[PDB]
Amino acid sequence: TLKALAQSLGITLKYLFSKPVTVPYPDAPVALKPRFHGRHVLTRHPNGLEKCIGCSLCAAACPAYAIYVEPAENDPENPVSAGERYAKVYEINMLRCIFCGLCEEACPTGAIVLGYDFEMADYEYSDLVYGKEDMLVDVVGTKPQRREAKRTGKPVKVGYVVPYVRPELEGFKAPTEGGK
Amino acid sequence: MRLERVLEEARAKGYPIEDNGLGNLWVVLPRERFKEEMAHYKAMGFNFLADIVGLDYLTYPDPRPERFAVVYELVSLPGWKDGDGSRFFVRVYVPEEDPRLPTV
Amino acid sequence: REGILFTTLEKLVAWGRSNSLWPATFGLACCAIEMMASTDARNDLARFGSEVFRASPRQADVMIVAGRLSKKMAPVMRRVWEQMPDPKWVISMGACASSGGMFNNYAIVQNVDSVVPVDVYVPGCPPRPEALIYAVMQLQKKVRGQAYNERGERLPPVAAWKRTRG
Amino acid sequence: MTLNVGPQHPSTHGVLRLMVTLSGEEVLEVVPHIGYLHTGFEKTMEHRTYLQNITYTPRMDYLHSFAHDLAYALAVEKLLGAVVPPRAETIRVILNELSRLASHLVFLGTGLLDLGALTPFFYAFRERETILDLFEWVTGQRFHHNYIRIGGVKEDLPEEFVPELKKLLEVLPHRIDEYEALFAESPIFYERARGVGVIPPEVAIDLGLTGGSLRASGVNYDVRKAYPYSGYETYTFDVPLGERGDVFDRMLVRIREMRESVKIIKQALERLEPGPVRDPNPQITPPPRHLLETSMEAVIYHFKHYTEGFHPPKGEVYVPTESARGELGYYIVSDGGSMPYRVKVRAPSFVNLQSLPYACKGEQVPDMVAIIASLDPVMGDVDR
Amino acid sequence: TWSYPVDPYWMVALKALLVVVGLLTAFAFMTLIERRLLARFQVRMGPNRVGPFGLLQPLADAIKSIFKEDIVVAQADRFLFVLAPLISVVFALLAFGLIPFGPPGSFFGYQPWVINLDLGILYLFAVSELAVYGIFLSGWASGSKYSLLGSLRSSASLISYELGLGLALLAPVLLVGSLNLNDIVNWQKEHGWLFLYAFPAFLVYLIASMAEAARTPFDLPEAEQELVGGYHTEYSSIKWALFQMAEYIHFITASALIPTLFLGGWTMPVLEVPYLWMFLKIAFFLFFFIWIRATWFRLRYDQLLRFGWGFLFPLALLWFLVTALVVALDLPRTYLLYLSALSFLVLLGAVLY
Numbered sequence A: 001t002l003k004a005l006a007q008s009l010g011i012t013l014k015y016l017f018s019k020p021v022t023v024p025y026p027d028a029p030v031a032l033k034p035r036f037h038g039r040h041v042l043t044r045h046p047n048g049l050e051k052c053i054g055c056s057l058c059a060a061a062c063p064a065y066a067i068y069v070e071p072a073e074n075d076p077e078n079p080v081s082a083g084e085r086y087a088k089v090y091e092i093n094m095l096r097c098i099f100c101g102l103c104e105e106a107c108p109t110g111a112i113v114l115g116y117d118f119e120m121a122d123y124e125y126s127d128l129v130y131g132k133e134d135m136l137v138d139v140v141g142t143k144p145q146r147r148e149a150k151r152t153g154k155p156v157k158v159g160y161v162v163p164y165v166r167p168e169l170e171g172f173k174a175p176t177e178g179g180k
Numbered sequence B: 001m002r003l004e005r006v007l008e009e010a011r012a013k014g015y016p017i018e019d020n021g022l023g024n025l026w027v028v029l030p031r032e033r034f035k036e037e038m039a040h041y042k043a044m045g046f047n048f049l050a051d052i053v054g055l056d057y058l059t060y061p062d063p064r065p066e067r068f069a070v071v072y073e074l075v076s077l078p079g080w081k082d083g084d085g086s087r088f089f090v091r092v093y094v095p096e097e098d099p100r101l102p103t104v
Numbered sequence C: 001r002e003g004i005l006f007t008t009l010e011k012l013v014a015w016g017r018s019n020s021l022w023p024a025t026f027g028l029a030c031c032a033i034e035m036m037a038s039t040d041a042r043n044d045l046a047r048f049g050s051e052v053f054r055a056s057p058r059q060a061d062v063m064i065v066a067g068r069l070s071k072k073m074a075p076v077m078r079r080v081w082e083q084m085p086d087p088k089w090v091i092s093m094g095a096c097a098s099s100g101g102m103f104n105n106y107a108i109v110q111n112v113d114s115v116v117p118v119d120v121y122v123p124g125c126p127p128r129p130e131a132l133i134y135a136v137m138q139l140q141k142k143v144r145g146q147a148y149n150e151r152g153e154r155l156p157p158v159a160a161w162k163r164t165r166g
Numbered sequence D: 001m002t003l004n005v006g007p008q009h010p011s012t013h014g015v016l017r018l019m020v021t022l023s024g025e026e027v028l029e030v031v032p033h034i035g036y037l038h039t040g041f042e043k044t045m046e047h048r049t050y051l052q053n054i055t056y057t058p059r060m061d062y063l064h065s066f067a068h069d070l071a072y073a074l075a076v077e078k079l080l081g082a083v084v085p086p087r088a089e090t091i092r093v094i095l096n097e098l099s100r101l102a103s104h105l106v107f108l109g110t111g112l113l114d115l116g117a118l119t120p121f122f123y124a125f126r127e128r129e130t131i132l133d134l135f136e137w138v139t140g141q142r143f144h145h146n147y148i149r150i151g152g153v154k155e156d157l158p159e160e161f162v163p164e165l166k167k168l169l170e171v172l173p174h175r176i177d178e179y180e181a182l183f184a185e186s187p188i189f190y191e192r193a194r195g196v197g198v199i200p201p202e203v204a205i206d207l208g209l210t211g212g213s214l215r216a217s218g219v220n221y222d223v224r225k226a227y228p229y230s231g232y233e234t235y236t237f238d239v240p241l242g243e244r245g246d247v248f249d250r251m252l253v254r255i256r257e258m259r260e261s262v263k264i265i266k267q268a269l270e271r272l273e274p275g276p277v278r279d280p281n282p283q284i285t286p287p288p289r290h291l292l293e294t295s296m297e298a299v300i301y302h303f304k305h306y307t308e309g310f311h312p313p314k315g316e317v318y319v320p321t322e323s324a325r326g327e328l329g330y331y332i333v334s335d336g337g338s339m340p341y342r343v344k345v346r347a348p349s350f351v352n353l354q355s356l357p358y359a360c361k362g363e364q365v366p367d368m369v370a371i372i373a374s375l376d377p378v379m380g381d382v383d384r
Numbered sequence E: 001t002w003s004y005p006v007d008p009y010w011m012v013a014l015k016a017l018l019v020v021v022g023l024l025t026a027f028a029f030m031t032l033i034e035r036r037l038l039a040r041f042q043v044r045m046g047p048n049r050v051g052p053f054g055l056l057q058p059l060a061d062a063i064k065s066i067f068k069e070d071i072v073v074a075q076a077d078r079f080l081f082v083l084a085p086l087i088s089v090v091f092a093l094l095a096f097g098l099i100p101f102g103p104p105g106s107f108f109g110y111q112p113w114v115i116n117l118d119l120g121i122l123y124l125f126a127v128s129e130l131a132v133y134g135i136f137l138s139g140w141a142s143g144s145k146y147s148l149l150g151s152l153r154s155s156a157s158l159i160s161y162e163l164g165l166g167l168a169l170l171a172p173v174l175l176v177g178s179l180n181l182n183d184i185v186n187w188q189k190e191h192g193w194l195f196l197y198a199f200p201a202f203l204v205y206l207i208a209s210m211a212e213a214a215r216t217p218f219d220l221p222e223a224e225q226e227l228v229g230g231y232h233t234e235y236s237s238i239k240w241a242l243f244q245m246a247e248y249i250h251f252i253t254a255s256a257l258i259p260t261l262f263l264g265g266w267t268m269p270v271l272e273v274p275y276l277w278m279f280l281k282i283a284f285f286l287f288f289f290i291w292i293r294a295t296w297f298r299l300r301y302d303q304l305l306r307f308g309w310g311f312l313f314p315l316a317l318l319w320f321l322v323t324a325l326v327v328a329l330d331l332p333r334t335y336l337l338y339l340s341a342l343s344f345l346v347l348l349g350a351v352l353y
Ligand code: SF4
Pocket: A051, A052, A053, A054, A055, A056, A057, A058, A087, A106, A107, A108, A109, A110, A111, A112
């Protein structure tokens, strides 16, 4: 009955004058937690040496089969990774990546570490099979972001923050409450 | 427990009685006698027919009597004013040649 | 006859078109539940020309193909697409749609782009709402013609001249 | 006439093609026509590993994801006889109940949306976000999760988890009430709901309805009580019940559930302390990765686990469980391969839908929309 | 008028022209406030980009509407299709120039209306039939019996309510002894604002004007996020915009009349501020409905039909009759005052338990 109808209005009215709680994107960075799963990064050692060996353990883990990995045996004089095997081609089709995370768990080099990326979307199928060098810990954005930032000449931002890094990542420093 | 008067009966009628150590039980019946048997059960106070899982044993690494096998799960809802929690399966091997079986 | 072919008109009209985007979501998946999320309650879309969020092509021309689908849905979707007005854009939302995630099966349709042409992919199942925002920002500047591909290659300001429009 | 309400409409988003035999001002019967989506998960998963199958489990329940997952987990766990740490089990209930709340949030959110006043949805959603934020924290995933792992979850809780969890338990009681506040009075609420949603308890079982439909008709039937599975034995909580099949009844039940759920949370927090988070039998469990560094045997098992994945023994198995959506269970035949030889899923909502032409006998035409909505369709059950 | 101004054909025209486009711009920015006020109401940020405050978004919207296919579909006839929105907008536009905006000869000394007639009430009442004409016509035009059936509901219901509005307008004509607005206003100028005089008629009127198309019984089927109105969803572009537009124009028209009626529009013995006082009354009721609109539900027309017809209309004419008794014997109008006030007081007391 009738009382309620009034009470209904009451509360909502409180809320009306309440200054809201919503966060504008991309105008205050999204709040993420360190375990969050963005775009995979390929890590390296302080020895400047890529951790991955083309472990390809992930590939058994990927139910989508989202990984095309051509292996190779490192240079003995100039090894691109200290190991005797590396990933001569590292491709990931993001169009079906499962971002298994199990992925990470199987990889023993800890090469693969989910990012904080999500700013990925483009118009063309085959551009969205992200490559090796797009999948590093050394890039400064997403593929479209970056590609924009050259033609526009603008710099970068990514619009997220975490409380702090995930320990797993230990290279790249992201915006963390202190960046955007 | 509602189950038990079915069990002695099943035994009486010599039906093989499968049991997993996980306490799941099947009763292996022929097609013909099923309907009526199952009629008797509902009458005996079987509340709830939960499932019908159709099984294809096309390829299996052990022999089975038939390729197609149905399995009913009957239950007695104890939370109802009747019932005992009496839950059990009935399996009924099925000729591939005739993919028939009277409904329930 | 659509607002083009003088300097003035095309920028004008294009601003109009770009900023008024009216999403018609084509839920059939988890996407939808994130989509209602995507609407409100953290972020808005009304500041991107959207009060339209609902089921009439009689209200919209922004097609968001949102979710993993089956064979049975292809002609349906096709027809729904057809029953939109002449300029119209195709977002392919999420992985589930875009290339069929983790299913390889008869039942499903993989590579939704089969059924209708696409202009925008936005991967991830689930993605973040915000990614979709980023996507429509893309789509904004895309229909504005201030876009390319990752090879610097230009493209039309519509989804709708990749296969037949109607 | 036979009216054809097609898929994706209006914002009810079942694939629904519905043949409504009308009197031109009434509903007589609906022949529902469905199955316009489907995958055949059950098939696919025999072509993936057991580990892999855990991907599939939350991918057919938008709502309480974790329940499917759990139910499947349990089945496996039983089969090879694996045990789960107490702390693990603590966590598992917490997530489960958190997921139940989520479900309810979405249920009522949609309820409002579907028809009736639109707005309060957004508030319920605010809370949902809070829940989501909790999920985000611990699993890095908004929803869909894999945190639960065989033998127990795969890593420890955040510390950050504790503050926020308390926080939201503070706010919610009051909030819950205020949603409830909209319903019970509003005499229009009455006039839209009370009369409709009819079905005898007797027929609820005959046509198959599951708790919160069955218990929406106040028939006590918690599968957590009846076939009590882990932890719940030793947790107090009661059954929330209605006493008749109507929309009206349903709606109030859910609110009560939430409060029960919250007390279970409350209970849980007390019973929470350090412990290993999964079974330490490395035969059956993947080993810790902080030890690959160390032994070969580790490396071997590790490698093996994530490649081939174990062989469970031959067996069929079923466990009945109480999901948010009703009677849940997996009938799993494994042949002892690396993949099962049968994955049957018990999908409650699907069975609950059988009772729709019945449920919707002789109803009124604007009412019929709600009557669908009130039952809660998640199309995954149906479509599979 | 028998004591009131006149102005050239040209000046008349100008005022008209202005007032039309004024109401366009009105509708535009109204949408903005509605959107934003909605957001805020449900604790949310809104249009703020492309503004500041989303200002230019309506432009975009309008521009969107144009440059589009705008076609008739087979199984409909062309002429009817075109006419059917047209009609509704003309007649929606029409009827607002009747009503004033301030004190006489004071729109820069020129008359503060566009037409003024001598027969206020009639005109309004008359216009009230013509919108619903547009509606059902559209239904039929569309050639889906689905659309049609909705429209039949709609119209039927509307028309039901339309009648109660009739029974309302007799009552003030009693009091003033006249039906032209100005005098009516002026009646309140001496004695005071008319809802005092007849709270249940204020009340019953109020709730009947709800029953206008206004998205506030808020089922009809209305269109936008329910089973739809048949005057939409078989429409396209600009034509669709028109319908939506119309619903809002009604909304505000009604929102204006209620001030007109129960207050003076700009009577307020405290101060004279013409235009200001108009808006303030507008504003009040405007928000008032919107607050209802938000926080209250979609109402099955089944319920509604039962509701208005059986209870609401009979009680309204009943109140009239009573007042007519008093007025016929021409008794102290104080004698109504007490009662009016009391009935409200009663029916107010009735709320809580
Ligand atoms: S990323 Fe890891 S798992 Fe993948 S190939 Fe490299 S070392 Fe192996």
